[PDB]
């Protein structure tokens, strides 16, 4: 139950994480996480119902979505937990993250195809099935569409925002959640998806295993924010159309509320917080 910085994993831990992810792909379970996510990407809108993104529930929805995925990994290998990618620190293509023993590198310039690591199409082990772009190979263009990941000073500016979220509780909001998500301000989470490129820049972004490591670090930033602001908590707290209030349940699970997900320690701890 401890989530570790990707940069600190041992060779054995890297091996076991890759093997568990590849087994979930082989069995057909992985692709249904990709499909769930795309359905919510395409339905969450600023003027209508919004649950997984562009809304206060972006953070608890991804916390539970990651917990679903980690649980599925642990059904293959109980030793595995999701590692996190601190992109403010590991900000170049020569991060061991992108080594052939972990996620593989950037895509070639012709067609963006990833050519090394365990998820390269050439292995036969990572077909892209849930897709919109018709190609069936994993693609990336690290640093192609935006030339820099967020920096720690940028992260710090966002962590300093005391209000969790503000009306109208969407992509136009001020406050912490939308600055972390990235639709306003210096842009943390959205920019990272743009920086990786390939399927990570699309609605089928969980096609790239780095999705999980990116969201595990966004999830850690929510935990850090909570520590910086013990007097701040999830909002809204009741009666808000189209938005998940603190004590309302969330789709797709229907049985869990943001309130049940604010304290990550019920589920996991970080190597350091």
Partner 1 sequence: AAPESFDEVYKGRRIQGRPAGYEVFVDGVQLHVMRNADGSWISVVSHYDPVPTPRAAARAAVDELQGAPLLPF
Q: Which residues bind Cu ion (CB under 5 A)?
A: 42
Selection from 52, 56, 17 nearest residue 35 by Cα: 52
Length of the chain measured in residues: 273
- Pattern of binders to partner 1 over 192-221, x per CB under 8 A? -xx------xxxxx----------------
Residue with smaller CB distance to partner 1, 145 or 249: 145
Selection from 165, 219, 102 nearest residue 114 by Cα: 102
151 binds partner 1 (CB under 8 A): no
126 binds partner 1 (CB under 8 A): no
Produce one character per residue of 45-84: b if its CB has 16 or more CB atoms within 10 Å, e if not: ebeeebbbbbbbbbbbbbbbbbbebbebbeebeeebbbbb
Selection from 209, 223, 186 nearest residue 119 by Cα: 209
143 binds partner 1 (CB under 8 A): no
Which pair of tokens denotes residue 72? Answer: 């599925």
Residue with smaller CB distance to partner 1, 19 or 146: 146
91 binds partner 1 (CB under 8 A): no
Tell me which DSSP letter residue 139 carries. Answer: B
234 binds partner 1 (CB under 8 A): no
Which pair of tokens denotes residue 74? Answer: 């642990």
Closest-approach residue to Cu ion (CB): 42
Q: Is the dihedral of CA 192, 13, 156, 238 positive or negative?
A: positive
- CB neighbours (10 Å) of residue 7? 15
Write out the binding residues for Cu(2+). Answer: 37, 53, 62, 174, 179, 189, 193, 215
Kindly indicate which of the ranges 25-33, 64-72, 131-139, 247-255 contains the residues binding partner 1, using the contact rule CB under 8 A: 131-139
Partner from partner 1, Cu ion, none binding residue 78, C-beta < 5-8 Å depending on class:
none
Residue with smaller CB distance to partner 1, 143 or 168: 168
Residue with tokens 């897709």: 131
36 binds partner 1 (CB under 8 A): no
Give the residues lining the site for partner 1 (CB under 8 A). 38, 41-42, 45-47, 54, 111-112, 131-135, 145, 168, 170-172, 182-183, 189-191, 193-194, 201-205
């Amino acid at each position: 139950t401890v989530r570790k910085n990707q940069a600190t994993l041992t060779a054995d831990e890297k091996r076991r994480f890759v093997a568990a992810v590849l087994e979930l792909k082989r069995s057909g379970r992985y692709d249904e996480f990709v499909r769930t996510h795309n359905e919510f990407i395409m339905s969450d809108t600023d003027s209508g119902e919004r649950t997984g993104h562009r809304s206060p529930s972006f953070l608890p929805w991804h916390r539970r979505f990651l917990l679903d995925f980690e649980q599925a990994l642990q059904s293959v290998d109980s030793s595995v937990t999701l590692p996190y990618w601190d992109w403010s620190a590991d900000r170049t293509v020569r991060a061991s993250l992108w080594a052939p023993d972990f996620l593989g590198g950037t895509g070639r310039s012709t067609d963006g195809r990833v050519m090394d690591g365990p998820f390269a199409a050439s292995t036969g082990n990572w077909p892209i099935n849930v897709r919109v772009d018709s190609r069936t190979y994993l693609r990336r263009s690290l640093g192609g569409s935006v030339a820099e990941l967020p920096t720690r000073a940028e992260v710090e500016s966002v962590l300093a925002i005391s209000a969790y979220d503000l009306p109208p509780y969407n992509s136009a909001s001020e406050g912490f959640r939308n600055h972390l998500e990235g639709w306003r301000g210096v842009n943390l989470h959205n920019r990272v998806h743009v920086w990786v490129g390939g399927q990570m820049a699309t609605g089928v972004s969980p096609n790239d295993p780095v999705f999980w490591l990116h969201h595990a670090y966004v999830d850690k930033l929510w935990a850090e924010w909570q520590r910086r602001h013990p007097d701040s908590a999830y909002v809204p707290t009741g009666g808000t159309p189209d938005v998940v209030d603190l004590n309302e349940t969330m789709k797709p699970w229907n049985t869990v509320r943001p309130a049940d997900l604010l304290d990550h320690t019920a589920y996991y701890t970080f190597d350091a917080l």
